[PDB]
Amino acid sequence: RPDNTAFKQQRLPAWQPILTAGTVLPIFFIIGLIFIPIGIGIFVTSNNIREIEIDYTGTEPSSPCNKCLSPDVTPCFCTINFTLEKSFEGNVFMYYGLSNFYQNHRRYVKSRDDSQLNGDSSALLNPSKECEPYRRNEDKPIAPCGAIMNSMFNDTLELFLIGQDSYPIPIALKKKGIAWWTDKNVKFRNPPGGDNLEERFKGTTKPVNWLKPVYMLDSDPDNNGFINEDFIVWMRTAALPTFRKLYRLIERKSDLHPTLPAGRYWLNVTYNYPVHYFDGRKRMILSTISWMGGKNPFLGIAYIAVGSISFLLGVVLLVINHKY
């Protein structure tokens, strides 16, 4: 009369796998033989990427920017010469890096209003509580609230190539397309009121550390406010005290000549950002990319180490179990 159901009587059909050494031994070999070639390929790929970093912070009396460390009302300019040995053929991405800059601090990460940057009219006129003490200035709310927006990197970097003669030639840099497409076209929007951008920000004011208001960053209305590529790129946190952010893109010449021929170059910079107050460092990185990204041998080294440590262990166990 009791229900003779397989579930109730604990008699559900099962697979019941029994893995043993004599059946899992080929796995230790196949994994090593599939992993070693991948490691070799990845490590070889990581060695054909050219990259150069130029530290231009100063803090040294033999550096050209020692005069840029402490100005008063003088807009400082530097110029650092450097040489390239092997030319760059692939695409070239301009980076700027900061050291000892804690972008992931708790009090600093949460100091933002993501709804206001989404174009919300209610949040446009009154910012969130979290972004303090950058919530109101001169009894007027700041349009971008928070330190994460207030302290944006604001240096101007220009590259100059010195030809056969002493006359330098400039290099064209494009500011479009350095931020994530999704967070540029969806997450960051503009206020919808009106067509002219200046009259959209009426009850708001520029940040304390700003020099021109947020609706005058660029002449093109597409990159004028809350859509500016540099602003959007800086709005993304770093996760580490030492980080790098994309700055410009150098495009391929139409003819098959390499994008950056080897030779001397000129780096005229505008020293506006103070970083020596907290023992920080500034640098500029020119690098090419590949199918995997930047230059890092860690992945290849780890794959080789894992493949070798698997294959050797498999061989050792194979020669040990041969006693039976």
Place this chain on the structure above:
Amino acid sequence: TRTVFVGNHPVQRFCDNRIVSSKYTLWNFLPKNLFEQFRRIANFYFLIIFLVQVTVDTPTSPVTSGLPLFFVITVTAIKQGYEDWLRHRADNEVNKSTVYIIENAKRVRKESEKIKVGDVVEVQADETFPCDLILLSSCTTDGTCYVTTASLDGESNCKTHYAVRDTIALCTAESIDTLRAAIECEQPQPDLYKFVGRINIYSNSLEAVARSLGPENLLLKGATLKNTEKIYGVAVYTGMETKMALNYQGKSQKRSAVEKSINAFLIVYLFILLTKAAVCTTLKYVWQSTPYNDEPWYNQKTQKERETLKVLKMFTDFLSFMVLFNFIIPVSMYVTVEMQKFLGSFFISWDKDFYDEEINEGALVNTSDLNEELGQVDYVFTDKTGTLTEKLQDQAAETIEALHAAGLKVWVLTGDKMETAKSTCYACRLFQTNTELLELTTKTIEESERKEDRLHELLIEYRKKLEHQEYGLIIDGSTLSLILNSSQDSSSNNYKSIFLQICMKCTAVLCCRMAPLQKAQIVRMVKNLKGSPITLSIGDGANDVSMILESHVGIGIKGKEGRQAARNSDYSVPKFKHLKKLLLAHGHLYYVRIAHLVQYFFYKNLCFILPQFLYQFFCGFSQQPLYDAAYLTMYNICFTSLPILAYSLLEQHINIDTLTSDPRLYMKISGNAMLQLGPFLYWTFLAAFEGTVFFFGTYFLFQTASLEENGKVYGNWTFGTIVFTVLVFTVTLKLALDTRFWTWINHFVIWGSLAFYVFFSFFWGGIIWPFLKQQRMYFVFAQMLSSVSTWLAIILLIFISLFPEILLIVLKNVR
């Protein structure tokens, strides 16, 4: 020395037949139950954590920490309240019964619970006595009555009692003629066979004849009257003082070895959490000593954080770190173990092996807190009449042989006489032909100090000098009474120890003519020696309830005697042969499932939290969570909760068909091996290794300056998502490797957890709702999966982490 008058007419300070077996009342129940529950360290901690999270700060929400604690409190409170209301209802039946009292020359009827000492009472045929009576007369001559004590010694033999010679003639003819008598008695004792007293019956003018009172005159409570029309007795002991009510001892509480191991693990993890929080706060306040490391002109305090008291600040930061790292002790474990214990107990009732067509009933589970306790039994105490014999039962000898083959010691505790008790033992294969009977009965002790010589002879110069099967002890209740009570006269060699060693070094022990309380005394004496042996007692009679309520787990047979022991026990089987199936397979499976669930629950959260603690060294020790709040909330609720519950409800570690056919396999989990220091350290070190591997493998991966073919950088939420994905895949694949009995439910839950995690990540990341104050995770997961470098790194990490487990699996298959 107490004096009672037969009719209360002179020629007090006693209770009033009121039996209470309960503990809670109908009002004080809530304050007492909450005080009893919140005294535990785990229940205090959870509260403290909930209050601190509500008061100071929380990373995700106070609800996720306040709701499961309330559910856990409520379930246990309901269980205890119901199990106490059942005892209230049972006591209501024993009280509020009908008895007939001759108060003033008339057959007054009162209620049973209103009996006062010193009134003559009348009981008809087949009526249970209401209290301790003293026989005054009987309907027939010779002053005799036939009383059977089916509820005191377990048998149904017709005993005989004798009335008072001076009072036999008084039969319904002026029995209340102000009968001048004074019953001078001894203070109540649980001996159940000794009674000293005297009567002071007077005459019409004056008399002083006094006849001594012995055990042949006491009419005990709870013994039915047989083959007599009507008798007349005088109550002397009424309620909480009768020899039946003295041998109860109540029920304190029962806890499992797994439950104690859970508390020990919680105590260890509490120290781990405190050390983590203290180290983090100390390093934080050392690092903030530099002027430019705090308020470095790019984020400054809102003046408040400056105006706050420094002394209060370290305490607040310590509470914040404790809240942040509190996840290493999961409330989910408690909420789950409750569901597992409630749901898994249904299999015992559902099993078709526990069915008897004669009784037309099945098994029964009274409590679900000892399912894991069924698989750790070490000693078995059995009752002779009713359980072993019905002649012997169907498989009484083979069940005992199987229990002996499993490494258990079977003792027979009965209330029958030695002559008939020893033959039954000789028929159950418990006493072989070539075994020397080591006997300590009353037949050889007719003094007092002969016992000390006998024990020394049979222990010090007979046995330990050496044959392990030959010697079997036989004892009597009378000798055991002196052994227990009179052991405090000499202290150089304790009687209890010198008797316990000879008991424990013997193959089997038989104890005859034993009171209901002495069984619980023997069980308690066994429970204390050399650590904590685990005891199980099985019986079918009302006299077995004292030893059923004292042992670790009590089994009650549904027999012809009654359901008195069936409702007071933890489980119930309508046979004795069912015990082999009940504890060989079901207990083993339950213990394995619960131990694996506990170990996995602790490991899964330690490995979850370790990367977050490691992350604080790379921020400013600012208590920045590595993962998103949604992931922190959803980790233990849906991503990893279901596979472990499905594993722990149905998983044949060894198939039951060969578990029942091989009793030898019970020894693999004899001493709580699965929850020992070895396995605990192995799981802890595995979690610590995997947690370090995750964080450092991703940290070395995040030094690229780019991971895409379009040259775009990643934030911190991508770092956290990478760590979380590697974490979830590793912790799911560990259990997938450990699984050994794959059903369609296991397939569904294990693969659906991963599929649901992926789909939930893709769904949460990609839609702006908007009802949140931030959109940090708008497209993090979808942007993270667009890089072959991250794909390859994740694939490499889910193998690097499991390499110790894969190597151990192989090494466990040779030598």
